[PDB]
Design a protein around this ligand. Structure first.
Ligand code: XYL
Ligand code: XYL
Ligand code: XYL
Ligand code: XYL
Ligand code: MG
Ligand code: MG
Ligand code: MG
Ligand code: MG
Ligand code: MG
Ligand code: MG
Ligand code: MG
Ligand code: MG
Lengths: 385, 385, 385, 385
């Protein structure tokens, strides 16, 4: 189960670089130089890395310092052959963003947020990124009177429209991906799920430029089924990128390594990406627990990849098994893929077998054979066939 | 706090008519004749009622029995002056719908579901309904292999497209409202939230015919903020109807009377509907608890209306208070309503006060004064000014 | 992975016998005669069955009918060699129990509840049951004013004390097990978790007679860690029985087959029961989904047992692996089992290496190596060593 | 609604002193000197303050610096007349506690944790504290193999036993209060709820010395009913202290001001404390949101007290209303307070009216009149009588 750069596994600098500060605790690990992370990731078999502006260039850096930071990073990429398929902006750490970036009540702040974003879009293109993520972690509220949501959506639309005008005018080959999260750090965050983000995109001036970047843990903090949310993004043609990690139910965002948390949901996600022919990066947005030292960080990162490869194998074996193919037919998955009324409205209306003469009791008596199918799925996942 | 028919309060037959059967218990109350419910509701000050096909005409009724059921109902409406602004279909009780209506794996079932729906659309128009609700309570799964979500969305789209073709061809003045719910009775239900339903509508052939019917308790079963979800529906121009009730967090769907459950969320919802000028029905989809007799049912129904009227009064007093208007200015709600960059992209890019010369520390130091505003909101809700 | 009666697997009559009625739907399956369930379970390899009074003898049965029902059941047991290790009372279905059994506000009801319970204790002993379960599904409330919890606990204590006096006086060899659940069917249920039930037992007149019957899904409806709750019951010497099934997070109680829901939590539960030497019944309290016919019911029941046996194998392989034993030492599990201060209070107070000279930074720098250990656990579960 | 020192309102230094650092953000406010907090709290009408060792004396302080810190604090208390009714230990911030204090795997750490605790017990007594709280925020795990819960409970018991031996030997007049929390910062924390802590106390060598310190938000992060948990602590005679704040459901711990979050649950809590004659401190463990400046901190602190006083008034009016007293009788609250069988076991067994002649249908038909009672409760809370 050895990964190679062909598996397209990526990691954010902020993941293996998390120092372990939490709401109740100081850091347990020293900071990692981005160059070191690049090298260690390459040795593990990763394909590339991602970054927030602030991960690469310390906030408030002079143009001189900025150039120096970039050059060193670029050298590491050249030395290892690692790519940079996505980048994003930090619009959440600094105190100025306490009420949001694009939807802060203060107009001056909103203008600042757009300028900080545009500067990073330029760098991202320079580095070859294909996707630019936006997670509005501070857009929301803890109380009802603080934010008029209709006005905030107007402000969010305005912001994304200006970014689309910008890339268009420059002639850049980059697309945007919005990342939803229901809460934390705000009481409630705007665009809380994959559905809310998809619905919002349809109101932008150039909808073709925007998709979603769903994250496992995020949809599970609302108790939603991740594989179902991803199927809806695929159906809309909007899965531009994906964030993989683990989460144990509805609580604070844990960011465990991928495979931990809900294992069966991880299995069904892998089955789907692989069946659907998803060809984007398999990005891990996780945090090695603060209990670990450096050895532990690398082990956790390696486990992310290992878990994906084991699941891939098990899902493939599941779909290729003749006995499973037979069970899918038994459960009428074939019939779900056929049109209900290709014959049209009129033909449906005139068809007595559809109502007048339909034997409802006979249809009701037919078992779905879902439990036998699910048990074959479990046997496959566990290597117990 | 007396309601009148002008307040536009409505109730489903199934609400005051719930006999009290739950997953672990038999009925505690006898069935109510629809005619009796109409009369009792009129006396309490309700404006109208709503129904599923099966609430009005017992499943499997002959055409003769059907006509008889309708005529009696129509007489009650005439006697009391009650209206019927919405109707819907039961595609969840009968065993034939065990795997869904529009997205059942069996094709024969899907065809049956559409025929049963079309028959009720005809009645709804006859009775003067303006809105037709669709809650797909059985569309979903308990296991991953049972439903290919991409195929199910194809099937759901096909179903809604055929219904749109139908109303168009007949020349009916009726619009559709999709009602999301995250789970129960299925393990996971498709289109689980207000966002997922809004995103789906944008892919239908004639999107103008469809909106949402959000329900308080439903979004709270996913731990989402209801007033925020409603603001997004308002922003999209898609709030065609609304279901009001109460819920105590993430658990089974309780369906308490409106006002019970999350009281502060009820306050913010009322403030919003009233501020936004929502002119549709205020419908209560709730269940008087099984502990109650008939006297208790009517008391609970009366409480739904009473609670809305008290909240309306308190929200109005909140918005009209000079001291609140001053606090909103202090918290920069005025600034949130102004465009970020009406000056345009170029002007933003050339504005040094937006980046180069922006004093981030001075901006960061500005308190939002949100807690004083929230305390004025609490004082108002409690009548403690 | 074939079960035999030696594995001690048991099922309630109500599990494979669930007809599929839910809050929104009618039954999908016909009722099963208890004799048929006994025979089918024996053929699958089960060790025994359990029952509520009402599952075996229809409510309101004459003494004549009662005897007839028992005799037929007894014949089935003799024919198959199945045992009856536990029984319980139905104090939740009939409308009289709408406000509870032992804690109903009406005193007459409370007296009735105790009489119905005592009659079943007698039968249970006759059939050879060793454990009597009590799940107070209707003890609780939907509103704050309806129940004074202090008075209700007095009433609950009184009830359990009288039952203890009863078994003592009769000389029966039976112990009681209280089963907690947080909600459903009441808004909140009293004694909502394993901890609340353990704390309550310590206030009864003869605490030795009572333990807990925890259920997987129940603790997961509160988002708690089941294996941790079971370890606390084991530590107190109070795990008298256990209910196994599956649950997908915080929502309505699903009652999936064991192994479904949280698979990793199922793995850790098996590891614990097996390590601790739990020698009681492995009882399955689950519901085959309403989508299934009879073939599906038996397949789901078979899957419960299969899943336990696979997990048992994987946990055993995990604990026996030399490389795991080494990792446990690396993570200081050995040190957690040694007393902190067997030397005593004074020796601790005088030990400078414990404070004055303790090198906090050196201790802080030591990684716990938890992620490598967890990855070995995952590899083992998946059969990927 | 003006508080006075007689209302017994207290605050932790860490509450109004929270700088606003979260998992995703830097501090938004400067640190407050403990002397300033004491003075500002006194002016608002607070009765006293509480502290962790580390809030008062910076970690790693010399004995010289320690004495200086104490003296300054003592002067502030004398100047204002504020008291210190409770103190606690910080066993969670420093990296050495990454795996816990009392239950860390490393034995050396466990010994250190006890020494740090004993030093603070001494100071607490010097300052006049009556209660010593213990919140084991780092005792728990993120993975199943990392902690053997049976061994950890042995370790936790050992720790509390040694602390009891210590206070006993010194002759101190102080009692311990254990504070449960389900998760955050660990994946799962040991003793997750009020029930688990109550059950654990019963296994300590001198159970009389220990009680619980429940916190509103903590039990709500598991979706439990706080007023019910408090009634069980009252019933056991174990409510030694209480932490008041607000929380919006199952998510990260928000720590809103008291009254925010679940308002109806706040009403029922106040009704209970006041009815039961709770005479301990009304302590606020909350965090003014990071959006606020200093003015906002004081406003939020003032709101905590204001909200309690308004609720107190409304609960008192509720209980004193003749119409409510009549409704309570209608709902049989009087009957819940009478013994079920003061006549005894034998008399119950011989009473035909309890079974043989009990009219179950007549009893079942009796409505509980809970909704009318709940509506009177709502009317009272809202000042709408
Ligand atoms: O909840 C944290 C989010 O996952 C972020 O890591 C984004 O993906 C990048 O800003
Ligand atoms: O969860 C139940 C839903 O609220 C239904 O009552 C719909 O509104 C009507 O089918
Ligand atoms: O939630 C349902 C409970 O699990 C019951 O099945 C008990 O175990 C028996 O009354
Ligand atoms: O979750 C944080 C806890 O409430 C702490 O504030 C304790 O009360 C004191 O250590
Ligand atoms: Mg996250
Ligand atoms: Mg992410
Ligand atoms: Mg509902
Ligand atoms: Mg509804
Ligand atoms: Mg259950
Ligand atoms: Mg059970
Ligand atoms: Mg907290
Ligand atoms: Mg606290």
């Amino acid at each position: 189960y050895q990964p190679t750069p062909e598996d397209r596994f990526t990691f954010g600098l902020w993941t293996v670089g998390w120092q372990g500060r939490d709401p109740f605790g100081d850091a347990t690990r020293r900071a990692l130089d981005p160059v070191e992370s690049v090298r260690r990731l390459a040795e593990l078999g990763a394909h590339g890395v991602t970054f927030h502006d602030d991960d690469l260039i310390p906030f408030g850096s002079s143009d001189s310092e900025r150039e120096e930071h970039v050059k060193r990073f670029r050298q590491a990429l050249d030395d290892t052959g690692m790519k940079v398929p996505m980048a994003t902006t930090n619009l959440f750490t600094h105190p100025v963003f306490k009420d949001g970036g694009f939807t802060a009540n203060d107009r001056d702040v909103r203008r600042y947020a757009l300028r900080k974003t545009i500067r990073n879009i330029d760098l991202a293109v320079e580095l070859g990124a294909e996707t630019y993520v936006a997670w509005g972690g501070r857009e929301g509220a803890e109380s009802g009177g603080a934010k008029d949501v209709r006005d905030a959506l107007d402000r969010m639309k305005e912001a994304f429209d200006l970014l689309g005008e910008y890339v268009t005018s420059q002639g850049y080959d980059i697309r945007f991906a919005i990342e939803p999260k229901p809460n934390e750090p705000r009481g409630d965050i705007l665009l809380p799920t994959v559905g809310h983000a998809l619905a919002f995109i349809e109101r932008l001036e150039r909808p073709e430029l925007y998709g979603v970047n769903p994250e496992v843990g995020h949809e599970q903090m609302a108790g939603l089924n991740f594989p179902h949310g991803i199927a809806q993004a695929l159906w809309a043609g909007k899965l531009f990128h994906i964030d993989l990690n683990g989460q144990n139910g509805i609580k604070y965002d844990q960011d465990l390594r991928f495979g931990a948390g809900d294992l069966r949901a991880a299995f069904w996600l892998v089955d789907l990406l692989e069946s659907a022919g998803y060809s984007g990066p398999r990005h891990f947005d996780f945090k090695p627990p603060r209990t670990e030292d450096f050895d532990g960080v690398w082990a956790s990162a390696a486990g992310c990849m290992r878990n994906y490869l084991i699941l891939k194998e098990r899902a493939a074996a599941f779909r290729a098994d003749p006995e499973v193919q037979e069970a899918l037919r038994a459960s009428r998955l074939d019939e779900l893929a056929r049109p209900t009324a290709a014959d049209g409205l009129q033909a449906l209306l005139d068809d007595r077998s559809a109502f007048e003469e339909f034997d409802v009791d006979a249809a009701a008596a037919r078992g779905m054979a879902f439990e036998r199918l699910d048990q074959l799925a479990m046997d496959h996942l566990l290597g117990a066939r």
